[PDB]
Structures are given as structure tokens and as C-alpha cells.
Amino acid sequence: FREIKGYEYQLYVYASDKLFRADISEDYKTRGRKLLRFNGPVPPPGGSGGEWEIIDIGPFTQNLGKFAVDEENKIGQYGRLTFNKVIRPCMKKTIYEN
Amino acid sequence: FREIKGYEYQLYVYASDKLFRADISEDYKTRGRKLLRFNGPVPPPGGSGGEWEIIDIGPFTQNLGKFAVDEENKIGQYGRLTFNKVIRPCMKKTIYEN
Numbered sequence: 368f369r370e371i372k373g374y375e376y377q378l379y380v381y382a383s384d385k386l387f388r389a390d391i392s393e394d395y396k397t398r399g400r401k402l403l404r405f406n407g408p409v410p411p412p413g414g415s416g417g418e419w420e421i422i423d424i425g426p427f428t429q430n431l432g433k434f435a436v437d438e439e440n441k442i443g444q445y446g447r448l449t450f451n452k453v454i455r456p457c458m459k460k461t462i463y464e465n
Numbered sequence: 466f467r468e469i470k471g472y473e474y475q476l477y478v479y480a481s482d483k484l485f486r487a488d489i490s491e492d493y494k495t496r497g498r499k500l501l502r503f504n505g506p507v508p509p510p511g512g513s514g515g516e517w518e519i520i521d522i523g524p525f526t527q528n529l530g531k532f533a534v535d536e537e538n539k540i541g542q543y544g545r546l547t548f549n550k551v552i553r554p555c556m557k558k559t560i561y562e563n
Contacts, residue, residue, distance in 0.1 A: 368511065368513075368561045368562070368563075369561070369562075371559060371560070371561055371562065372560045372561060372562045373560050374557055374558065374559055374560065375558040375560065376529050376555065377555065377556040377557075378529055378530055378533060378551050378555050379551065379553075379554070379555070380533055380534065380548070380549075380551050380552075381548075381550050381551075382530075382537075382543075382546035382547060382548050382549055383544075383546045383547050383549070384549065386552075387533075387543075388501075389529075389530070389533035390502060391529055391532060391533060392504070401504070401536075402532070402533055402536035402537065402540075403486075403502050404488060404502035404504075405533055405536070405537040405540070405543075406490070406501045406502075410470065411552070412552075412553070412554060413466065415466075422474075428474075431474050431476055431487075432478040432480075432487070434489060434498060434500070435476060435478055435485075435487035435500055435503055436478065436480045438499075438500035438503070439480075439485075439487070442500075442503070445480075445485075445503075445505075446481075448480035448481045449480060449481050450478070450479075451479035451480055452478070453476050453477065453479075454477045454479065454484075454510075455477075455510070456477070456510060457474065457476050458475040459472055459473070459474055459475075460472065460473040460475070461469060461472055462469070462470045462473065463466045463467070463468065463469055463470060464466070464467075464468035464470045465466075
């Protein structure tokens with residue numbers, strides 16, 4: 368916990384006049400960067416703090432993991448994957464209407 | 466801010482015995498789900514809290530946005546995009562070595 372492994376940056380980015388969410392990893396030692404997420408268009412953030420909480424890892428959460436693996440298998444970036452389980456911590460963010 | 470637009474779930478998921486980070490959106494009204502991120506393998510989370518902070522939107526952050534758009538243009542999910550700007554809030558997470 369003394370040695371840094373890397374960073375993750377989460378951005379709201381306007382491109383072609385539409386708003387996207389993008390996540391970027393940056394390795395500490397090599398400075399190498401990777402795009403992890405780029406989705407939208409998304410609503411602009413409110414001037415107040417987002418609402419987020421850790422949720423349990425019961426059946427609903429396990430099912431989100433199954434969904435994620437099923438959707439990733441349609442993409443194929445990592446070959447054919449077999450879902451094992453979701454572990455703690457799981458986070459839920461609630462996005463409110465303007 | 467009274468009406469919910471949807472939720473976002475952030476998971477650590479084991480698939481084929483490797484650990485990935487996955488993010489899922491869930492629309493409130495339709496319950497429709499989308500995979501937004503699935504990357505790894507990633508280190509397992511520590512038993513303590515992750516370290517995260519909001520950072521300014523100066524040149525370094527603008528450059529992360531340019532990177533994100535350049536990388537998304539190599540994917541093409543949204544056509545050819547033109548970077549405009551990164552807006553607040555931008556978040557930085559530090560991932561420490563085990």
C-alpha cells in the first residue's frame with residue numbers, strides 16, 4: 368500500500384458536442400495509458416455530489432456479474448469467459464433526472 | 466433530482482478465474498442494461514477503502530480527454546469524434562500495490 372501501482376481517471380468529456388463518460392488507466396511505472404470506458408451520450412452532472420453506495424453481493428449482484436460476462440462474451444476482447452462470481456466491494460450509483 | 470434516471474453498478478467479477486472490473490448501466494424506467502466497461506485482469510481490492518479525489522480540469526486533464534477521444538476513434542463505436550473539452554467533475558483514483 369506504500370508502492371503505487373497506477374491511477375484511474377474518470378472524466379466527463381464533450382466530443383462532437385455530445386457528452387460522454389470516459390475512464391482511463393495509467394500505469395505508474397511505465398505511464399502507459401489505456402481507455403477503459405467511453406460511453407454516452409450521458410446527462411451532464413449536477414452541480415451537487417453524486418449519490419453512491421456499497422451494496423451487498425447477494426443474488427441480484429451475482430446476476431449483474433453474469434450479465435457483464437454474457438455481454439463481454441459478445442465482444443470477445445478476452446475470448447470466451449466463464450462467469451465465476453462477483454466479490455466485494457460492489458458499488459451502486461443513482462443518477463437522478465435533471 | 467427527485468426523479469431517478471437510472472443506476473450504475475461497478476463490480477469486481479471473477480471470470481475464467483481472472484479478476485475484471487465491470488460497470489453496468491441500468492435505466493430506471495425500462496430496466497434496460499448496458500455493459501459500459503469490462504477490463505482486466507485487475508488486482509484484487511484491498512480490505513480497506515480505495516483512495517479517490519476530484520482533480521482540477523487544467524491542461525493535464527484536458528489532455529486525458531484528448532487521449533480518450535483519440536482512443537475511442539480507433540474503436541469507432543460513435544463514429545469519428547472531435548474532442549471539445551473535459552468538464553468538472555474529474556476523479557482520480559490511486560491504485561496501490563498489494
